[PDB]
Amino acid sequence: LPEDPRWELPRDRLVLGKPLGEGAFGQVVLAEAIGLDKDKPNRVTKVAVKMLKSDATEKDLSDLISEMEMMKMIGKHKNIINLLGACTQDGPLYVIVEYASKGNLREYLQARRPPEEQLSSKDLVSCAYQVARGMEYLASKKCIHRDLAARNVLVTEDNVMKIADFGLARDIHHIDYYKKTTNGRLPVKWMAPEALFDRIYTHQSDVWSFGVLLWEIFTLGGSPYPGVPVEELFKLLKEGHRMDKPSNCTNELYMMMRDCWHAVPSQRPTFKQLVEDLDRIVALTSNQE
Ligand SMILES: CCN1CCN(c2ccc(C(=O)Nc3[nH]nc4cc(-c5cccc(OC)c5)ccc34)cc2)CC1
Numbered sequence: 001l002p003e004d005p006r007w008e009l010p011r012d013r014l015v016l017g018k019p020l021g022e023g024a025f026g027q028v029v030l031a032e033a034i035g036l037d038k039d040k041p042n043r044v045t046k047v048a049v050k051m052l053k054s055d056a057t058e059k060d061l062s063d064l065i066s067e068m069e070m071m072k073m074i075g076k077h078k079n080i081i082n083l084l085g086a087c088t089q090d091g092p093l094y095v096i097v098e099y100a101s102k103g104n105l106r107e108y109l110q111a112r113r114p115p116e117e118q119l120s121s122k123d124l125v126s127c128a129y130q131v132a133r134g135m136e137y138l139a140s141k142k143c144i145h146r147d148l149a150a151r152n153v154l155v156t157e158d159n160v161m162k163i164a165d166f167g168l169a170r171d172i173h174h175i176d177y178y179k180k181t182t183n184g185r186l187p188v189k190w191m192a193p194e195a196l197f198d199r200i201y202t203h204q205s206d207v208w209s210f211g212v213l214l215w216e217i218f219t220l221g222g223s224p225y226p227g228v229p230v231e232e233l234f235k236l237l238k239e240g241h242r243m244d245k246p247s248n249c250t251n252e253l254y255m256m257m258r259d260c261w262h263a264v265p266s267q268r269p270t271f272k273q274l275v276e277d278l279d280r281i282v283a284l285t286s287n288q289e
Contacts, residue, residue: 001065001088007072009033009085009096020048021104024151024182025165026064027053030099036084047084050095061093067167068095074141074167079134081154081164100154100162105131106183108155109221119220122287125253128217129278130161135210136271138166139203146170146201148209149190150216151181173199177230186233189224193237194265204265210274211260218249252281 015032031049035041050067052060071083087094102108105127112119119127131153138145145152145166154162177188177196188196190212192205212224224243225233242261245254256277262268269277 001093003089004072004086007083007086008089009036009087011087011091011094014049014087014094014096015044016049022182025050027051031096033085033096045084046099046101048081048097048099050097051092063168064093064095066169068093070143070167070169071095071097074138074143077134077137079130079161079163080137080166081162098156098162100164101157102155102159104164105150105153105155105161106216106221109150109217113220120287121248121289122282122285124217124220125278125282125285127161128214128253129275129282131163131213132210132271132274132278134161134163135206136275138163139206139271144201144203145206145209146195147187147190148206148213149187150213150221151183153213172201185223186230188230188233189228192265193263196234196237202265203271204268207260207268207271207274208265210271211257212243214253214257214260215243215246218246218253222246 013034013036015034017030017032020028020030028048028050031047032044033047034044036045036047037043050064052064068083068086074080076082081100082098083095084098085096087096109119135145135148143166145163147165147170148163152163152165154164156162178186180186190209192208194200195202195205195208215224216222225236228236240263242258245251256269256274259269260274
């Protein structure tokens, strides 16, 4: 691998630890990095580190490299998982990124269902706002996520939402529609119809996904279309079926979901608009329940 002084960290500055993400994101571990920022060489920073597996092919390597290079191009934002460094010389590839100590957004929501303090209505809307901001940023940098979902949003120690796994151009025609997530759910249930049927991925189809994620948030981690298999989902979408309004969700926010699921992609809102709408809604939403 060619060295890149912008990002290189000597690998003896890294203390490796336990796995993260239950394999969903490949081999990612928690680590401690000494002197990440060279201004404070004596501080340690908890970071996430992604690396190849033992039984890994040549393209597994090129993919990890592409992922890293992509993250370099995209630049930094508060509501995405940022690149922090790399170990590329004299050993196996390490990609060093921000650590989100509270796991993914689906888990985090579920753990705060009534029987871990319950979330206020304002908290929930604020969660939506942060995810829209990260996506607004990524879209502005010409990045299409293709798998936006609460499982790919990570939460920091300070309850900041970060979009994860935006760096890989995953093998588009090559996707297993029947393959389930780590949780046992079907990723097709987040996909816009034109992405699912015509394999056309855009910022507009990411917005569809965001509507489903919105529905995840206000159901506190609910599973979309529970019990519905792939073939039946296809039929549902061909018919123009839409998920019902969650309880404890305003008509305004349900209308937002429905707009994100506009049958005509050009008519869906942009992440720019969603951020603006969500920003106003936050300021009017009570945190007293
Ligand atoms: C109450 C019980 N809780 C306790 C906390 N716990 C968890 C669970 C999971 C995490 C976690 O995965 N954190 C992560 N932070 N940053 C992360 C980056 C990637 C990542 C992804 C793609 C590409 C990449 O590099 C190129 C990296 C992955 C995972 C990451 C933390 C706490 C759950 C249960």
